[PDB]
Amino acid sequence: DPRAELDSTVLLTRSLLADTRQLAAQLRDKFPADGDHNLDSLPTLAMSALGALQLPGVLTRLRADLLSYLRHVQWLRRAGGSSLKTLEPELGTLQARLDRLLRRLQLLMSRLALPQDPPAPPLAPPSSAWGGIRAAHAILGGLHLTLDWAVRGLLLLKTRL
Secondary structure (H helix, E strand, C coil): CHHHHHHHHHHHHHHHHHHHHHHHHHHHHHCCCCCCCCCCCCCCCCCCCCCCCCHHHHHHHHHHHHHHHHHHHHHHHHHCCHHHHHHHHHHHHHHHHHHHHHHHHHHHHHHCCCCCCCCCCCCCCCCCHHHHHHHHHHHHHHHHHHHHHHHHHHHHHHHCC
């Protein structure tokens, strides 16, 4: 019964993962990354949760992480220079799809009868065209890693219905 909703949500997540890779690939072709750009405003990458007791924490964390990515994607569209202007509408599509995914996750969380505010980031516009390019690498790369983790976690949830 709950497995159908979950399988839909795994599919959406895989598709969002592919969307995120494609976007990162396009950026990379335009401006290859010059290092591993830590954005302080981004969440720390979650440690890849075998048991049924660990999974609620994983969903809670996943949601918190994706909301942060959602704010950062918006920020990139708002504050991106002409250097990102050609990727902006794809980012817009990505943001719609992430919004959709998040709502699915929240539903899933209510169907499973789980429990569970104040946001500061990402905030200020990049110091230069290059700063924004650096942030885009970090945002899309972090989102990629988070979704790949998400896929695996939702698969383990499936085991425990």
